[PDB]
């Protein structure tokens, strides 16, 4: 059937009926040639056919429609019971196996691409996706945890707040507002990571690109636990105009078992070397231009770079927002 998961490369914008907003979002981006972490959507029908396999639907509705919406003890109660069922009832085999298979596919493809161990335990993020509250689990490892966290996502539909808000609506609306999708995406396993601005934070010059980069996970650069290398390009060209290479003393990497990060020392030989090649700056610079023309304002981008087993450098776009000062001023 194939009804329950869809790879990101195949999700379009016009798939909002089946994957929701966040996921059709990520779909248009890949489509616009913006390289977001690879993964798949768990489609709205995974949750839908779950609640329809037994009386589960009637009972959750009953619970939501039952509540004293001005009593907190009423919301707690309904929340508790609702969640127990959402994590508890049997998941239909067709749903479970497809989610399992989609994850194994991602893990094997990735282990091939990264040229790392094919151990079916690739770390992923799992994040909820309303059809029109964000739940996020990071560093999820193995098919069992993916299934477990996908269910947690479905359960977050039944917070005190979320219940109270649907308890109001017409049955139609609550049914439509109970639809959910789930995104399963690679955690980065960055060789180099960092941030990029398509405007100078300092001057508000919108004709330059600033990249701050360090070894391993972007966390060391985002949290200021390392002194990054700094590069400046002009957009016209693009032309590299300036670099400043630091002693990069620490990095974060994935934990071996994939469940967290670990802080460690960058060994001598790598500390004072430039962590981005001239071709990689140009890759990054080009993605910044794409990303900024897509959104239509200057960006503050968080990126990662992986070197694939064959050798090609692959840039991942992890997050992106308007650059704050440009925005503050405006």
Numbering used by the authors: 1 to 132, 143 to 340
Q: Any passages from the paper?
A:
Crystals of HpeI diffracted to 1.8 Å resolution, and the structure was solved by molecular replacement using an HpeI AlphaFold model (AF-A0A520FAS4-F1-v4), with the N- and C-terminal lobes as separate search models. Notably, residues 133 to 142 comprising the conserved loop could not be modeled in our HpeI structure and are presumably disordered. Given that HpeI was crystallized in the absence of ATP, the crystals likely represent the open conformation, and it would similarly undergo ATP-dependent closure upon binding, though no crystals of the nucleotide-bound form were obtained.
Catabolism in GD02 is initiated by a two-component kinase, HpeHI, which catalyzes the ATP-dependent phosphorylation of AV or HAP to 4-phospho-AV or 4-phosphoacetophenone (PAP), respectively. The structural data indicate that HpeHI is a two-component homolog of RPH, a single component enzyme involved in antibiotic resistance.
